[PDB]
């Protein structure tokens, strides 16, 4: 009747930015004698929404708080709770309640808990533990054992202590979690065969890599190989065939490097090696990486989105202007 | 309905009758909900007790009412009462240009632009020339040029240093068979846009081919380059240098060119000499692997950008899809615009 008028009013202008006219209304609903309990706690339900999109989070946490032990309130208000202590990166609180949500027991969680775990970890690499950070990655792996990302940090970690053979393991777990994330792990991978004395194995690895078209990383790797090998000639030749096969800004800068450095010399390099210089810099220039969730793009590789909030959603761009 | 009125009386018992009704139908408004907003508004405008100034409130609400919902001609009613008001003339003027250009009323917007430029809008000078082009636009459908010139003069008049105005006299005069006259309008974006000097250079290559002034035409073309206006001089410029000169002497040009602009557009061009006279090797291998590829690359770059909401295009649009501005959108440039 009017309390349920009084609660959609309030979300009403919560939903069009005016959330302190929304913190109001229902903060006096919540607080009025008029009401049932029940009606109450829609009213602290909706209050502790209103805090969330103020960024008010002490508040809204106390509003859910006083809902978890409730039946028809706990899913939501272990779910905001879940948001907030993300949102203040309150890790250890966030793994907690998604715990709980997960001993609930909501399915998905387990993604989340994960990638908590590894902003654990992340606190102990520095600082260098290193076996806290490795337990706490062996627990988000436990979470969840699809993770791409607990495989990658627990290959830095393994390299840390100097074991190679362990990371190879953890990193080439990749393959089979998320193809698309392989191109991340091919510079510590190249590190740790080079370790294990298998230098030759690691050109067969980028050989089948290529041809899984993983991009211009493994490419340009096994070039510098395919030169340090068998000469500039058979290099140049390689580049040549992928270009054509994979055509990509940063293959076509490396193919002009081995033009330019077999022919000069005069006013054609002059202009070509401008030429060059300008694909460089618009390489270096252009995103490396790209939300597939919102298109929020970016230089470095963000696990958690800055834009849309999501979890392993942004990978390497692809395509010309790409990989 | 029920719900609204319940909505307006606990809203009224903290602000009164009159805000109650403004706020709640604009929140219905920006909700997309407009007839309800309409209707809530339309109430408040039916009580007897409402002060001028709050009449004139309610006007405002709508006005946005009507054109959340494109009923523009009712918008245009309630906004045409608030512009002999002075707290509202202005925004109300504002309110009513953008509907005439959404309902390419192009005469209606002139006269409301117009008002605001005297009223110390300057920058709807810009507008006022783009909207007599638009009308221009359609007396040349429709091959009443008399008509469209005659607009196109009006537009000037408006903004003298209007680029598309140049063009379009351009058009008109090449549609008279007028070549001379042409070239003496569509010299003028030299002057008034560097970055659309482009866009005229196939109009003045066929006014100067049916002038036979194939020598002031090179002059026109020095004249773009020296004022680095892209790559389309160069390359038009490259071919008059090896019909003229020969294909050395046409890629030690471009090779000059390339040296000091950069673009991928006159690199194509300075690969289609070397593959023009290299043989087999790793020379066909190479070579043709690169030139073919940037060839993909420029043909699937988009061509403009809009420099105030960087919108991007494969055509020339003189009012940008996106942010709505006049005269934004212009040619890129690096590679391989420049
Ligand atoms: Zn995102
Ligand atoms: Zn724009």
């Given at each position: 009747?009017?309390?349920?008028?009084?609660?959609?009013?309030?979300?009403?202008?919560?939903?069009?930015?005016?959330?302190?006219?929304?913190?109001?209304?229902?903060?006096?609903?919540?607080?009025?004698?008029?009401?049932?309990?029940?009606?109450?706690?829609?009213?602290?339900?909706?209050?502790?929404?209103?805090?969330?999109?103020?960024?008010?989070?002490?508040?809204?946490?106390?509003?859910?708080?006083?809902?978890?032990?409730?039946?028809?309130?706990?899913?939501?208000?272990?779910?905001?709770?879940?948001?907030?202590?993300?949102?203040?990166?309150?890790?250890?609180?966030?793994?907690?309640?998604?715990?709980?949500?997960?001993?609930?027991?909501?399915?998905?969680?387990?993604?989340?808990?994960?990638?908590?775990?590894?902003?654990?970890?992340?606190?102990?690499?520095?600082?260098?533990?290193?076996?806290?950070?490795?337990?706490?990655?062996?627990?988000?792996?436990?979470?969840?054992?699809?993770?791409?990302?607990?495989?990658?940090?627990?290959?830095?970690?393994?390299?840390?202590?100097?074991?190679?053979?362990?990371?190879?393991?953890?990193?080439?777990?990749?393959?089979?979690?998320?193809?698309e994330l392989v191109?991340?792990?091919?510079?510590?991978?190249?590190?740790?065969?080079?370790?294990?004395?298998?230098?030759?194995?690691?050109?067969?690895?980028?050989?089948?890599?290529?041809?899984?078209?993983?991009?211009?990383?493994?490419?340009?790797?096994?070039?510098?190989?395919?030169?340090?090998?068998?000469?500039?000639?058979?290099?140049?030749?390689?580049?040549?065939?992928?270009?054509?096969?994979?055509?990509?800004?940063?293959?076509?800068?490396?193919?002009?490097?081995?033009?330019?450095?077999?022919?000069?010399?005069?006013?054609?390099?002059?202009?070509?090696?401008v030429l060059r210089?300008?694909?460089?810099?618009?390489?270096?220039?252009?995103?490396?990486?790209?939300?597939?969730?919102?298109?929020?793009?970016?230089?470095?590789?963000?696990?958690?989105?800055?834009?849309?909030?999501?979890?392993?959603?942004?990978?390497?761009?692809?395509?010309?202007?790409?990989?």
């Amino acid at each position: 009747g009017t309390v349920e008028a009084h609660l959609t009013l309030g979300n009403l202008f919560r939903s069009r930015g005016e959330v302190d006219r929304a913190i109001r209304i229902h903060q006096t609903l919540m607080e009025s004698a008029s009401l049932t309990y029940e009606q109450r706690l829609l009213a602290i339900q909706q209050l502790g929404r209103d805090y969330m999109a103020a960024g008010l989070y002490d508040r809204a946490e106390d509003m859910f708080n006083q809902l978890t032990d409730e039946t028809d309130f706990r899913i939501g208000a272990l779910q905001q709770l879940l948001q907030i202590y993300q949102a203040t990166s309150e890790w250890q609180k966030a793994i907690d309640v998604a715990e709980r949500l997960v001993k609930l027991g909501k399915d998905k969680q387990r993604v989340e808990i994960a990638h908590f775990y590894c902003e654990l970890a992340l606190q102990h690499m520095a600082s260098d533990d290193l076996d806290r950070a490795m337990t706490l990655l062996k627990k988000g792996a436990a979470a969840d054992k699809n993770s791409a990302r607990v495989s990658i940090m627990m290959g830095r970690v393994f390299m840390a202590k100097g074991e190679y053979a362990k990371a190879v393991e953890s990193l080439q777990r990749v393959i089979s979690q998320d193809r698309e994330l392989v191109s991340e792990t091919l510079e510590m991978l190249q590190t740790c065969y080079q370790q294990l004395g298998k230098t030759a194995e690691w050109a067969e690895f980028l050989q089948r890599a290529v041809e899984e078209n993983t991009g211009a990383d493994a490419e340009l790797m096994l070039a510098d190989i395919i030169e340090a090998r068998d000469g500039s000639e058979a290099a140049q030749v390689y580049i040549t065939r992928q270009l054509q096969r994979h055509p990509t800004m940063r293959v076509f800068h490396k193919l002009m490097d081995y033009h330019l450095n077999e022919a000069e010399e005069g006013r054609a390099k002059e202009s070509l090696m401008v030429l060059r210089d300008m694909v460089g810099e618009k390489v270096r220039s252009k995103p490396r990486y790209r939300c597939q969730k919102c298109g929020f793009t970016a230089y470095t590789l963000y696990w958690h989105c800055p834009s849309c909030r999501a979890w392993s959603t942004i990978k390497p761009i692809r395509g010309l202007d790409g990989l």
